[PDB]
Ligand SMILES: COc1ccccc1CC(=O)N1C[C@H](C(N)=O)[C@@H](C)C1
């Protein structure tokens with residue numbers, strides 16, 4: 001589990017969105033595994049607007065933050081899970097790192113801010129849904 005809280009937005013994995021998220025929906029995209037809902041309170045996270053390919057992510061199944069090198073956002077084939085069939089997921093970045101299904105939502109960050117959230121993994125890989133192109137998260 002986990003979310004990004006920037007401005008009056010909450011960014012979560014679409015597959016973990018709650019009824020309150022759907023009832024306060026701003027934007028969702030199944031191909032990216034992302035959903036954004038509105039919040040009453042202002043958040044403290046800031047979004048990175050950069051080209052970093054190194055950062056640090058939070059892994060709840062180890063209670064640890066790990067440094068990682070990750071690929072550029074791309075269209076990658078992801079195997080079937082409890083939440084989606086096997087399909088291509090867009091804007092996904094892969095790294096070598098520990099992950100388990102409930103690690104989705106952990107933040108990946110660089111010196112500029114939040115880069116994305118854990119969305120996929122297995123066998124010593126972890127995949128992150130990028131948010132750096134969603135410029136509207138920084139306003140209104
Ligand atoms: C945290 O991910 C794992 C880690 C180890 C093993 C398996 C997983 C699960 C995993 O790969 N997915 C990909 C799915 C997607 N974003 O399409 C999502 C619903 C679950």
Ligand SMILES: [Zn+2]
Nearest residue numbers: 050052110112
């Ligand atoms: Zn950066």
